[PDB]
Structure formats: structure tokens, C-alpha cells
Amino acid sequence: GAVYTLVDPFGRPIVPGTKNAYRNLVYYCEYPGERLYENVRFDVNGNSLDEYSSDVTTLVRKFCIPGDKMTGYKHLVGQEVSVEGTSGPLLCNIHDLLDIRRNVHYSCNGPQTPKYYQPPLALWIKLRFWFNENVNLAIPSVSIPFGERFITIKLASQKDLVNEFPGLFVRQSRFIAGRPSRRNIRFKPWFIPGVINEISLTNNELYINNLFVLIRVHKTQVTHTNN
Amino acid sequence: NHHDEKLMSALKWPIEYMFIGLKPTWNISDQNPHQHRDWHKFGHVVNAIMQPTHHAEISFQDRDTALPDACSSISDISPVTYPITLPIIKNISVTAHGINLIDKFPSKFCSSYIPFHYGGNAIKTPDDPGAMMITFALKPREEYQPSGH
């Protein structure tokens, strides 16, 4: 009884065998701004004073960033936020031992939503060091020369930032004969990897708050364990 | 269009952290069907609509049984409307009397990062990207002392 058709993830038919009809939907990884700065170090003629990775960034996100500013951090690093919508009036009941009530749903349109054409995205990744916390502990720009201060970042790969969603689903109708005669229709994804176009980093800038007129250095390490 | 420079003369006292919101006139307009729902939103509001149908495919013959003999597409009476506040500003700019001050900063910078870093616990980040802030002091609410204006 199993009959198979090819359908698009929105239910549109594909007419199998036709060339250039199946295009995969593409993700972004959750929190692209954290994974982009995979390894950040600060150098003053070598001798790296501060060095951290993306794991320190997601740890200080999980711990230090408050819930009021959670939507701000999710907008900065390019995370989808839940847009809340409403359905409409409903029947309901009131059991006490009748009333009109609206149903609230949540949906997302952001980067992590699988899309056929993901729009160009704005990453604003905050840089965290020991002198970025207190304005009284901000290091002077005149105590040491500005030439020797350098920042080195290891950007992640394109395969580490963008994943693919299956843009084709095998739709299986199945007529189970009998009384009752069930018709189970299921969908199994058809996931064949394609070639994602190369991501072009545009408007790469660093914003520095150069205002006009003891310390807490965070020491991080990464270890791999198999015991 | 494409350049909207507005000058004011009422502001004479020193200015601390400043919230600015650019609400479309259509949000509070009478002609808006969603005026009441979208009045408190400083961005361009659109509506994404779920129309969740109840699909059911039924076969009658018990012989052909490959393409269903009938289907059904019962939609709900009230479709689900999500209000999206798309951003209304691309590059915000606040120019002072003699210095450049704020020059072509993106709206995501002034709407997300500045509430995130400046303000402390007392100032939260708004969900609507149209609402934004321009900062003038290092300590907006962290202490009761002028740290810049």
C-alpha cells in the first residue's frame, strides 16, 4: 500500500527526475556571534596577556548576562527571538467546584530558521577582557605605544557556521486495508549536501570607545578528557 | 527621503542617556486596521499569518488505494497573526554643534548594544528594534553623580 511522492518542505510537489528543482534550505548555527570569534587573543609585542575561546563566551553568556538583556545579546550575535502572536477567540469552558479566550503562539523568523535565501546578517560581537568592566580600570592609551597593541581572532569555518536543512521530503501514503482502512501519510527527509556559496565578510570594523578624560584577569583553559 | 536632518532649540540643559523612538505615523493612524495592536511599536509592523488547516485524506474504493479518493482542508476561523516590527532606521546619526558626535551608527548598534552595555540592571533592552538610545555618560544609573553630558 505504500506510495511515495516527492514534496517540498511546504507541501509543494517536485515531479521527481526534474533537474534543478530541489534546493536545500540553510541554517545558521545557534549564536553565530559566539562561534565566529573562535579564539581571541590580545598581544603587546607578543606575550599574549589575554586569550579566550568561544566556550568562555557562551559560559559568560549563560552566567553573567542578565535575562533583561538576553534579547539584546540574542540580537547582537544574531540569534532568532520568539515573536509572540495570537490566534483568536475560542469556545473554552470554566469548571468550578463559557468564557472567551485567545490562544497565544510563538514563532521565529530569525537566522536559525531554515530559509531558501538567508539575508545578510549583522554580527556585533562584544570583546571581553580584564579592562572592559570598570571605567576606572581602563588601561591608558599613553602608558604604552599604540602600535604594539594587536588583536588576533581565529574566525570559524563556513561549515562551522552554516548548516543545511533537507529541502526535499519523501511523502509516503500508506493504505492499510481493513476495517477501518487507515491512510498513514508520513514524511522522511531527503538530505543530500550541496555547495553553500562562500560567505563574504562585509563592513568588518572594530568599534573602540575612545573617550576623552587591582585588576581582574580571567584565566581560561580547555582540556580534553576520556577517562 | 534618504536624509532627514532635524534641529531643535528647546534642549539647553546638559543631556544624559537619551531614549529615542521613531514610530511610523501609520501605527497611530486611524486608517490602520491594527492601530490598537501596533500603536506601541517603533518599527514597521507586518503580519505573518498561520492558516493551520486540518488535512485528512480518505480513500473509498479499497482497490485503487494509491491516490486518495477525497481530501479535506478545514482551516481555523481565526488565523494566527504574528506582528513583526521590522527596523525603521538604517543609519542613525546625532551631530553636535561643532563635533561629529554620532555619525551614521546602525540602528542595531544603538538599539541592542548600547542598552546591553550601558545602563546596568535598571535599563533593559527593548524587543522592538526601532526604539534605541544614544548614550552620553559612562554610568547612567550605576551611581547618582554626573559622569558625562
Partner: antibody, heavy 124, light 109 residues
């Protein structure tokens, strides 16, 4: 290993009856449908009759509706076809075929294994 | 209402041949489910293709099925000397169930 050998056909006068018996071996005959298909010597195939898995729910072809009555006995793994009346058109090779459900369920979509064929030669 | 095949083609060994079957009146929709059968003389017919593009186990990969224009097509690419047989097309009409063609005798030279 799996076979659908059949017998019981021969030269009969027109307007007569024949009893075609098809036996099956080693393929759990009670669980698979069996059909009867006619092949004329030069006019191609022609599907005659269906009996279902249990034995009931018999549906025939339009040209031989009522003329041919099919039956099934799962105890001895046999399918019977009764040709109650025969014109001169019915001389052909008859095959008992195993056919389960792929798209069209009861008439059969995948005629997997065919019998060797029994030749009915009606002649006055 | 009947299905018609052409009487014969001839194909060279290692060549590609395309047998066609079609309704007498109307189009051959994919809901008519063409099924192609091969019958070597002295042998019972064998299921080659069912549901217009699918092959049961044991059928060689060289047979392909399609629906072109308003007819159904069996394409044999690199046909061998074992393909010289009678080829039958059958369409599933809703009322008359499977209706089989006259038969195309493929000649492998």
C-alpha cells in the same frame, strides 16, 4: 524454489466448463493474493480474475464477468478457476500469478512470479 | 477503450531502444499506472516495471520507465542479446483495471 505450477486444462468443446487448479509451494500461499491472467497466442495479455488473501472479495474483468468463477483453498494451497461457459475466443494460455499490493491493492500491482501457463484450446 | 502498442522495433546490441504504449483515446496519466512486462518465448511473462519508474528485485538496471508526452515509454540502454522477447504494456483504468497491450517483439540484431 517458489513455484506456481498449474494444471487441469485441455481441449474442450465450446459451451463447456473447465476446472483450472493452481498449486503453490514454499511461499506461504495463504498470505499472498493470486490472480488469473489470459494470454492469447497473438493478441497479448488479458487479466481475467482475482481472489483475495482470505478467499472472499472476488472481482472479475468486464469481458468475463459472471462467465468465470474463481475460488481459493488455503488448506492445500490451491486456487481454482471455473470456466463455466466457453466461446471460441477463450483459447489462450492461462497463468496463475502471485500479485501483492503496491498501488492498486486487490487487482494487484506487482505480478511477481508467474506460473508456467496452461493451454486452453477450445475447438468445435 | 484499449491500449495500443506498435508491432515491433529492432535494436542493435549495446544500443538504446524506446518502446511506447498509449491509450486509444485520451492521455496516459501517471494515475493510469503503466506496467511493462517481458516474455521470453517459451517462458512466462516477467514483471519489468510497475508504477512507471520502479523495478522489482532481480530486474536489471538497464530498464527504465517514463511517461513522455501522452504515452508511456520503456527505455533499454545497452540492450543485450537476452532482451529479444515480447514486451507488453498494461494501464490501470479505473473501471476495467489492468488492460494489456498487443505486444511489441523487440529484435536484437
Amino acid at each position: 524454489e517458489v513455484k506456481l505450477v498449474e494444471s487441469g486444462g485441455g481441449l474442450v468443446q465450446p459451451g463447456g466448463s473447465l476446472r483450472l487448479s493452481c498449486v503453490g509451494s514454499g511461499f506461504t500461499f495463504s498470505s499472498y493474493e493470486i490472480n488469473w491472467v489470459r494470454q492469447a497466442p497473438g493478441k497479448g495479455l488479458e487479466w481475467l480474475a482475482v481472489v483475495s488473501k482470505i478467499g472472499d472479495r472476488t472481482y472479475y474483468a468486464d469481458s468475463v464477468r459472471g462467465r468465470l468463477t474463481i475460488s481459493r483453498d488455503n488448506s492445500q494451497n490451491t486456487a481454482y478457476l471455473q470456466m463455466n461457459s466457453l466461446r471460441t475466443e477463450d483459447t489462450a494460455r492461462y497463468y496463475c500469478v502471485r500479485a501483492w499490493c503496491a498501488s492498486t491493492c486487490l487487482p494487484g500491482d506487482i505480478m511477481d512470479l508467474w506460473g508456467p501457463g496452461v493451454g486452453v484450446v477450445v475447438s468445435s | 477503450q484499449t491500449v495500443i502498442q506498435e508491432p515491433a522495433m529492432s535494436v542493435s546490441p549495446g544500443g538504446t531502444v524506446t518502446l511506447t504504449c498509449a491509450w486509444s483515446s485520451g492521455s496516459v496519466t501517471t494515475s493510469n499506472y503503466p506496467s511493462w512486462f517481458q516474455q521470453t518465448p517459451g517462458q512466462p511473462p516477467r514483471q519489468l516495471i510497475y508504477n512507471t519508474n520502479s523495478r522489482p528485485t532481480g530486474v536489471p538496471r538497464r530498464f527504465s520507465g517514463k511517461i513522455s508526452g501522452n504515452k508511456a515509454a520503456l527505455t533499454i540502454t545497452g540492450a543485450q542479446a537476452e532482451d529479444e522477447a515480447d514486451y507488453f504494456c498494461g494501464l490501470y483504468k479505473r473501471s476495467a483495471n489492468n488492460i494489456f497491450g498487443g505486444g511489441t517483439h523487440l529484435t536484437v540484431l
